[PDB]
Design an enzyme around this catalytic site. Structure first.
Site, PDB file in Angstrom:
ATOM      1  N   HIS A   1      43.324  35.145  52.139  1.00 37.09           N
ATOM      2  CA  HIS A   1      43.050  35.569  50.780  1.00 37.09           C
ATOM      3  C   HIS A   1      42.080  34.604  50.100  1.00 37.09           C
ATOM      4  CE1 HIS A   1      46.528  38.564  49.853  1.00 37.09           C
ATOM      5  NE2 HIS A   1      46.052  38.731  51.074  1.00 37.09           N
ATOM      6  N   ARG A   2      41.627  34.974  48.912  1.00 40.94           N
ATOM      7  CA  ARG A   2      40.708  34.139  48.163  1.00 40.94           C
ATOM      8  C   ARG A   2      41.522  33.153  47.366  1.00 40.94           C
ATOM      9  NH1 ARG A   2      36.225  36.462  43.969  1.00 40.94           N
ATOM     10  NH2 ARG A   2      35.976  34.558  42.713  1.00 40.94           N
TER      11      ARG A   2
END
Ligand SMILES: CC(=O)SCCNC(=O)CCNC(=O)[C@H](O)C(C)(C)COP(=O)(O)OP(=O)(O)OC[C@H]1O[C@@H](n2cnc3c(N)ncnc32)[C@H](O)[C@@H]1OP(=O)(O)O
Ligand SMILES: CC(=O)SCCNC(=O)CCNC(=O)[C@H](O)C(C)(C)COP(=O)(O)OP(=O)(O)OC[C@H]1O[C@@H](n2cnc3c(N)ncnc32)[C@H](O)[C@@H]1OP(=O)(O)O
Ligand SMILES: CC(=O)SCCNC(=O)CCNC(=O)[C@H](O)C(C)(C)COP(=O)(O)OP(=O)(O)OC[C@H]1O[C@@H](n2cnc3c(N)ncnc32)[C@H](O)[C@@H]1OP(=O)(O)O
Lengths: 202, 203, 203
Positions: free
Chosen positions: B82-83
């Site tokens: 994920h970011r």
């Protein structure tokens, strides 16, 4: 904008991604936050992923808002434990006289409630053990085994899992936990995602 | 002599041992060397063990040669991440408005390519995370989560997997890392198996 | 008074709880104590949880009495080690004239017996690895991976498994160890369970 938080499957087609709230919204002593999703490992729904969780033990599952939960994640509510002040052998399972030896509540484990905050990333194949509370905006590394508590915006990983490091300067966090966007009106967030993604809303 | 590397299922009347190269032959951005095998946990072929491997994201899987890779081993690629510069929530994938927030090639992370060396033995049910480099001769212990490079002829293992000891003294390693017996033509390796199994080949 | 050990499903109409002794009763090189039991995952039987256990390799598996083994526990006997003096590649798997390089026994690893004690509670998804002993009373936390011995009446968790804490103070343990209730005439045991459960069997 947005998808509906009350649809079990908020992605036309995708039947792996599930918003958990609705599913778990039947369950007792499970309170869930909108928009937090689970991603199915085999198509199973998240409910099947809570284990040893019995109303008669009064322990609670809190999961916050905007959480990402991956496949294989199992949460282990209190029912799991063998009594441990003596022999740990559950004589009462097997009956024929032994049935008379069930544990009277109090001599049962109670390790507490289980708290997953907001904006929490739990990797794939993760196991939350009874008792633990996981901090707002925390990341739990994949194949981790969480037995301690995880501070907000900490990176925890391992088996047993440890606080690897903060994801931000302690001041950003402090602010972040102060502002608490997940709570903002939906109308507001839709116009702040990039500042929320880029950590600017501070 | 021996089996033909190009045979997906080399052992006769058997579907559980696999040479990988032939199997991951239809998989972009994956290079796999000859003779390395998988042992299916239950008949899944090894391509299904390569997780979160997306093209756009331009990260590559390189497995070497003469590797043994046991059942349930999983190779996670950079598509798993994920970011993390803010909310690791994926607003986008839900869309219906949020799709405008899809991350940009360079907004996400990429922890590297994944490299497993030659003659390296990965244990049962081991989890390899993105960007890890295992050197030739190495051994990862069962049920290990690897998040670190492993160096030539290390024994590593655990969660998180750490290095434990060196399989051999360092004359050997440095020597074993020299001659590179795995690179030899198999009809020359053939006449040297027994000595490759007791490491005296170096002489 | 009690259940029947000779029964693999001591609870009528439940095929999930399993008395281990009668099940492995004919398995070679596997000794199992009475009353010790397994809770089934997705319907498996415990025999199917003992892996790479090759009668030819001469290693054994002792399980003590009144043990609880949790779903998905796995006991990995020496058959799951490669040769290691040199290349771990099992040249000898794929035949075609590579049979000659089969390992003679003494070339393989022999971590030796696996010994689990009396009154031991092994977590769900624990991995006992070849050659471990686990003490009476011990306890092994879920998704553990045991690789070393565990002393009696200890708690242990992780991957690697390590000792966490003593279940009770030493001297309490020392009593428990002397009086060895798990050996008593089940008729005696039957009259002192309460005391067995509140440790008050040493007063
Ligand atoms: C939609 C999707 O694709 S999500 C589907 C599946 N998702 C996943 O499985 C995601 C899993 N990702 C993880 O768990 C990763 O471990 C991450 C993303 C949390 C790692 O994040 P990173 O912040 O990049 O930090 P990082 O990889 O640099 O490593 C930092 C340290 O932590 C340690 N570490 C990494 N993983 C772990 C772990 N699982 N347990 C213990 N320690 C760890 C490393 O040894 C490293 O050492 P060092 O700090 O001195 O360098
Ligand atoms: C036929 C088939 O297909 S077999 C298929 C399946 N195969 C497998 O799963 C292979 C699994 N094999 C193993 O994991 C083995 O135990 C091996 C390869 C690690 C053997 O390692 P070894 O070289 O024998 O040495 P060893 O077992 O002595 O242990 C040495 C140390 O490593 C440590 N150790 C062992 N495993 C781990 C681990 N996973 N994590 C951390 N430490 C470990 C021990 O605690 C020990 O401590 P110490 O150094 O002071 O003594
Ligand atoms: C009905 C059924 O069949 S379900 C059967 C299967 N059930 C299970 O899997 C039960 C699993 N139980 C466990 O693993 C539990 O964690 C237990 C019972 C082993 C631990 O019991 P506890 O004694 O309460 O200790 P806790 O207070 O929880 O643990 C003590 C310490 O060990 C630590 N610890 C817990 N798990 C681990 C682990 N896996 N590795 C290392 N340390 C650990 C705790 O963080 C704690 O730290 P601290 O010392 O400051 O407090």
């Amino acid at each position: 904008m947005g998808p509906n938080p009350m649809k079990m499957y908020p992605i036309e087609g995708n039947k792996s991604v599930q918003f958990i709230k609705p599913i778990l919204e039947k369950l007792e002593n499970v309170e869930v936050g909108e928009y937090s999703y689970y991603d199915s490992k085999n198509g199973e729904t998240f409910d099947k992923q809570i284990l040893y969780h019995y109303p008669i033990l009064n322990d609670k599952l809190k999961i916050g808002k905007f959480c990402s939960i991956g496949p294989g994640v199992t949460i282990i509510m209190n029912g799991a434990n063998h009594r441990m002040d003596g022999s740990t052998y559950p004589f009462n399972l097997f009956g024929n006289g032994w049935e008379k030896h069930m544990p009277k509540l109090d001599q049962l484990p109670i390790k507490g409630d289980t708290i997953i905050g907001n904006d929490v990333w739990i990797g794939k194949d993760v196991v939350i053990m009874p008792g633990v509370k996981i901090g707002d905006g925390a990341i739990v590394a994949a194949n981790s085994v969480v037995v301690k508590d995880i501070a907000p915006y900490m990176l925890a990983g391992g088996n047993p899992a440890n606080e690897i490091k903060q994801r931000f300067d302690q001041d950003t966090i402090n602010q972040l936990l102060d502002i608490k966007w997940w709570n903002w009106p939906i109308d507001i967030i839709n116009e702040n995602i990039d500042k929320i993604l880029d950590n600017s809303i501070i």
